[PDB]
Design a protein around this ligand. Structure first.
Ligand SMILES: CCNc1cc2oc3c/c(=[NH+]\CC)c(C)cc-3c(-c3ccccc3C(=O)OCC)c2cc1C
Ligand SMILES: CCNc1cc2oc3c/c(=[NH+]\CC)c(C)cc-3c(-c3ccccc3C(=O)OCC)c2cc1C
Lengths: 184, 184
């Protein structure tokens, strides 16, 4: 009756005031004290590896409930999953604007990845089969992830401000990143 | 001497808070009164247009200065241009953050936008020949510009954090931008 208020506080804080959020305001929302948070989340990073897993879970649980488990085409499957990502993102700006710092902050662990890699078996093998091998290496994977998110968030941004073309931005955005990240 | 101060301040604030940045914080950081800022620039939107041009001219001066005539190959010529642009962004990180948020802000006038296209007449032609027809159009230009800027921004951010591999991020990002925006 408070943990998801200490994550319903962080999301709304990381969002507005960047990875350096003021734990003071944080308390004023979940209604707790400093050590309280630290009795759920040991350190500030654990908070950032857990809040990321929290916000990731939701994003995936969202992306799975729209998976038409029947279609074959790797690109078509990637196209349908891109729709979900944009949807969740438009539905949950603050959430998305918080998962944004997290995936590009480095305060993340390598097990946090396998949590965010396995947590959706379908996209993981799909990427292995579609993404340039260079964006699958240890050295340039984060870069590849960075480009994908920057393209998704740009697509989110335009969709939200011009709702009548939204569909066209989604399709245009998807095709752009597909050429950028997959095999020719 | 105050106008330049206002510009320099507006750059630093927009980089941090986008176009929502306060006109009071801007004046204050430039060591002038908020009333004064508004005698130089009657609206916030007028400030937004001038700083855009200020920044664009600065960015294009760098590109022109570093352009090699000897370059006869089209793809190679846009690579060299890309390096300069990234470099300009590595050198001037707030200038680029401000430039990107201004560029995508829907408050730019038609003349600003026209006068911008026409600072690098030759690169401007270059873009018309290379770039996907759809990203040059009336409806979707602004999206293209956004996609482009997202890619160079992510390139720039990875190169600055992990400079050991700066050259590779820059090359990888160029190739990603090329497949995303240019025609076959
Ligand atoms: C919070 C959301 N976080 C992420 C969401 C992502 O969604 C992705 C969707 C994709 N299509 C569906 C729209 C493709 C092709 C790659 C994606 C990547 C991705 C990009 C570059 C390299 C690897 C991956 C990647 O996921 O590697 C898995 C083996 C990705 C990465 C992150 C961090
Ligand atoms: C502050 C910087 N402002 C801009 C700088 C830009 O630099 C660009 C460099 C390029 N090559 C070198 C790396 C290419 C190919 C396109 C570029 C575009 C561009 C991208 C998409 C659609 C049109 C254009 C464009 O410039 O259209 C002109 C008609 C571009 C756009 C803006 C706003």
């Amino acid at each position: 009756d408070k943990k998801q208020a200490l994550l319903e506080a962080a999301t709304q804080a990381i969002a507005q005031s960047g990875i350096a959020a003021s734990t003071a305001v944080i308390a004023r929302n979940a209604g707790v004290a400093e050590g309280t948070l630290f009795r759920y989340f040991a350190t500030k990073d654990e908070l950032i590896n857990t809040l990321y897993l929290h916000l990731k879970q939701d994003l995936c649980q969202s992306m799975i409930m729209e998976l038409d488990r029947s279609i074959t085409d790797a690109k078509m499957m990637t196209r349908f999953i891109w729709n979900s990502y944009i949807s969740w993102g438009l539905n949950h700006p603050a959430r998305h604007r918080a998962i944004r710092q997290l995936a590009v902050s480095e305060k993340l662990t390598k097990e946090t990845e396998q949590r965010a890699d396995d947590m959706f078996p379908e996209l993981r093998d799909l990427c292995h089969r579609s993404v340039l091998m260079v964006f699958m290496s240890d050295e340039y994977r984060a870069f590849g992830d960075g480009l994908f998110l920057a393209l998704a968030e740009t697509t989110m941004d335009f969709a939200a401000r011009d709702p009548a073309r939204a569909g066209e931005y989604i399709a245009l955005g998807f095709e752009a990143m597909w050429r950028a990240l997959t095999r020719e």
